[PDB]
Amino acid sequence: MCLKLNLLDHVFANPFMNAAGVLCCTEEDLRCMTASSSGALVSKSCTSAPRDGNPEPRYMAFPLGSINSMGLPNLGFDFYLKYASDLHDYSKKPLFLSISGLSVEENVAMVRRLAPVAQEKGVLLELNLSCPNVPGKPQVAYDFEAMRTYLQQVSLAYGLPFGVKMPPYFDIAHFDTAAAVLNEFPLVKFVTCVNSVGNGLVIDAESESVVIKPKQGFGGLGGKYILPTALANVNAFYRRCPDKLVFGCGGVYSGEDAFLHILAGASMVQVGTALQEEGPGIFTRLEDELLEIMARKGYRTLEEFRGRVKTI
């Protein structure tokens, strides 16, 4: 038994990949992810120009997960585009390129240049509408009219299939509205749920201090803290977007957590905090653990249980 699957006209050895931003900023990082046993990889969310990002310390991990305010430190779109066009070995695994412009115009500029490389190489766009860490830049997908504008303009400029990295929602009406906006756009072929639970605050009791420097300590949460939130979002969008794929992201540390994401509706399963903490060895463990659970339950394929979470 193997975990191989086909999605978006690509073949994947297994459903696992890094979450955008983790182990994917430099050429070294991307080569490392490519050498790993992951089924795919995604690059660091990029901007038109290189960015230093927010002041350090800007990432901290704890038993229950992580907090960060990276601020989109990245080598610039030119680099990630070059990686996709010239450097990536597509024989190894598919590549997603994440973009996170600070305006609709910036995203449009990037996708116009990405299009020919997508046409030639088959790199897949993940449009980030949920960066919660750039000062003065609210999460785009929390403003439904802004989200519609971004998707209209990107759809028109790109003209090719793409996906969207979504923030978590916490309100049924918001699931309804957000999914309806996404459903307006036939080029949106996948929906990645979720980005960090935004603007949490970790405080150290001994020092009586916040643990990250940017934004007075306020940063995106990932890891164990967010698994039920992530599962809810995966399932909410799976139910509401029956003609799209949902990629699960949030709180994956084990094959069991991945199994839950897939039960909720996930096609691919992304790994952030746990990968940052454990390193790329995690991918062999996740594959082994997922296969073990499947074997115990008598499941032979991912399709046998994807989206088959039971209700009472």
Ligand X SMILES: Cc1cc2nc3c(=O)[nH]c(=O)nc-3n(C[C@H](O)[C@H](O)[C@H](O)COP(=O)(O)O)c2cc1C
What residues are annotated to the active site? 131
The residue range among 24-32, 46-54, 79-87, 172-180 that interacts with its own copies, by the rule CB under 8 A, is: 172-180
Q: Residue 37 and residue 281: Cα distance in Å, rounded?
A: 8
Annotate 253-296 with DSSP letters as a single string: -SHHHHHHHHHHTEEEEEE-HHHHHH-TTHHHHHHHHHHHHHHH
Which listed residue (217, 248, 272, 280) binds its own copies by CB under 8 A? 217
Write down the least CB distance from residue 258 to ligand X, Å.
Answer: 11
Restricting to residues 205-224, which ones interact with ligand X according to CB under 6 A? 222-223
Query: Count residues contacting ligand X (CB under 6 A)?
Result: 28
The residue range among 19-27, 29-37, 146-154, 254-262 that interacts with ligand X, by the rule CB under 6 A, is: 19-27
Asked if 261 touches ligand X (CB under 6 A), the answer is no
Phi, psi of 221 (to 5 degrees): -100, 140
Q: Residue 80 and residue 44: Cα distance in Å, rounded?
A: 8
Residue 38: contacted member of ligand X, its own copies, none (CB under 5 to 8 Å, by partner type)? none
Of the pair 54, 273, the CB lying nearest ligand X is at 273
Considering only CA atoms, which of 226, 221, 128, 241 is closest in space to residue 175?
Answer: 241
Q: Please state whether the peptide bond connecting residue 167 to the residue before it is cis, i.e. omega within 30 degrees of 0.
A: no
Asked if 260 touches its own copies (CB under 8 A), the answer is yes
Of the pair 83, 299, the CB lying nearest ligand X is at 83
Strand partners, 40: 17
Which listed residue (13, 22, 75, 111) binds ligand X by CB under 6 A? 22
Of the pair 41, 212, the CB lying nearest its own copies is at 212
Strand partners, 248: 193, 269
Q: CB of 255 within 8 A of CB of 286?
A: yes
Q: Residue 91 and residue 37: Cα distance in Å, rounded?
A: 13
Residue 3: contacted member of its own copies, ligand X, none (CB under 5 to 8 Å, by partner type)? none
Asked if 237 touches its own copies (CB under 8 A), the answer is no
**Cα–Cα distance list, 186 to 85, 88, 182, 183, 312 (Å):** 26, 28, 8, 7, 33
Asked if 20 touches ligand X (CB under 6 A), the answer is yes
Element (H, E) at 107: helix 104-121
Phi, psi of 63 (to 5 degrees): -50, -35
**Cα–Cα distance list, 218 to 167, 221, 224 (Å):** 16, 9, 18
Asked if 68 touches ligand X (CB under 6 A), the answer is yes
Q: CB of 197 within 8 A of CB of 221?
A: yes
Asked if 112 touches its own copies (CB under 8 A), the answer is no
Write down the least CB distance from residue 96 to its own copies, Å.
Answer: 25
The residue range among 112-120, 143-151, 172-180, 273-281 that interacts with ligand X, by the rule CB under 6 A, is: 273-281
The residue range among 102-110, 146-154, 207-215, 268-276 that interacts with ligand X, by the rule CB under 6 A, is: 268-276
Q: Which residues of the shown chain bind its own copies in the complex (CB under 8 A)?
A: 57, 64, 67, 132, 138-139, 142, 167-175, 197-203, 205, 207-210, 212-213, 215-218, 221, 224-226, 228-229, 231-232, 235-236, 256, 259-260, 263-264, 293, 305, 308-312
